[PDB]
């Protein structure tokens, strides 16, 4: 269990937490604003998934400051997580390419 597989695994777990908490915080922030469609938990969870994966169909979109602020956190946490995995996959491939040589 090296670092790159530990961080990537921890990123996946953290991403799940952000998706769940993001759904809760989105509804809590979007309600009270007339015209907002992100006001129920199940679809807010679906919105979080297509937000963290960047994607963004447009069927659901935050219209409040805190609702959009939550979205930004979801985006970054999504991009970083899916990006931390790629960096982990590279370290795996690089470390094995040395084994196909003299290291």
């Amino acid at each position, epitope marked *: 269990s090296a670092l790159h597989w530990r961080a990537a695994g921890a990123a996946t777990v953290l991403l799940v937490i952000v998706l769940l908490a993001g759904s809760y915080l989105a509804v*809590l922030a979007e*309600r*009270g604003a*007339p015209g907002a*469609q992100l*006001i*129920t938990y199940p679809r807010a969870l679906w919105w979080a998934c297509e937000t963290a994966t960047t994607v963004g169909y447009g069927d659901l979109c935050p219209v409040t400051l805190w609702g959009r602020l939550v979205a930004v956190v979801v985006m970054v946490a999504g991009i970083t997580s899916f990006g931390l995995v790629t960096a982990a996959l590279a370290t795996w491939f690089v470390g094995r390419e040395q084994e196909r040589r003299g290291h």
Partner: antibody, heavy 118, light 105 residues
Framework: QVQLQQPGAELVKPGASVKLSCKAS????????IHWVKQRPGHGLEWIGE????????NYNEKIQKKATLTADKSSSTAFMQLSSLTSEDSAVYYC???????????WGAGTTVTVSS | DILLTQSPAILSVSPGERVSFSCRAS??????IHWYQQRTNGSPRLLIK???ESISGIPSRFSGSGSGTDFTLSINSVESEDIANYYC?????????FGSGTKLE
């Protein structure tokens, strides 16, 4: 079991105030929203406002005159609606309902018949 | 705010006949509409959630359909205990709104 409990009636004279209660039972999640619905005799349902006991945040209907204050109490699982400075137009039956956060009102209360007179 | 129009206000029907209630939204709300029932001096009771999804406890007599702006609550062969006030409620955009209501006789 009766999930939502409300007082039978509340008599208020114009200018005064009243604090209705909505003691809830059954499954109490963290995503539960307590709504309040006003219904005048002969008329239909009217959404007053909503509140989430978990966070304490409350939203209200903006199209009508705002004279309601929603507070909660997680210790006793009871929602409270504070009506201030009422007139004859505010005399109606006030229902409270529980929403699981999925849009619809699963269960309603018996409703509190608030009468405004001297 | 989304406006929900229920026409007609009073719906008269013979016993054992199929009766359909109407609910029209001022804008497309998908299937985020919900039907309720309120008898004389009673509390509203959920009949149909999300346009067509049925509720446990509610008789199979009731059914729902529609999508977008037009929705319909139908009762296959109506009986005496179905005499009440029927309201529709949307949950697509904040705030939640109700219909004007429809009286069944």
């Amino acid at each position: 079991q009766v999930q939502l409990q409300q007082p039978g009636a509340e008599l208020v004279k114009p200018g005064a105030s009243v604090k209705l209660s909505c003691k809830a039972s059954g499954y109490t999640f963290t995503s539960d929203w307590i709504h309040w619905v006003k219904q005048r005799p002969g008329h239909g349902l009217e959404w007053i406002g909503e509140i989430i006991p978990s966070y304490g945040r409350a939203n209200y209907n903006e199209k009508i005159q705002k004279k309601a204050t929603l507070t909660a109490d997680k210790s006793s699982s009871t929602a409270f609606m504070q009506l201030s400075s009422l007139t004859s137009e505010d005399s109606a039956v006030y229902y409270c309902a529980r929403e699981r956060g999925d849009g619809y009102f699963a269960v309603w209360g018996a409703g509190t018949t608030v009468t405004v007179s001297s | 705010d989304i406006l929900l129009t229920q026409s007609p206000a009073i719906l008269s029907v013979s016993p054992g006949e199929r009766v359909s209630f109407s609910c029209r939204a001022s804008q497309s709300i998908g299937t985020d509409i919900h039907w309720y029932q309120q008898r004389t001096n009673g509390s509203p009771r959920l009949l149909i959630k999300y346009a067509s999804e049925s509720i446990s406890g509610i008789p199979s007599r009731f059914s729902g359909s529609g999508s977008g702006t037009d929705f319909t609550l139908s009762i296959n062969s109506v009986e005496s205990e179905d005499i009440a006030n029927y309201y529709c409620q949307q949950s697509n955009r904040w705030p939640f709104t109700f219909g004007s209501g429809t009286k069944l006789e």
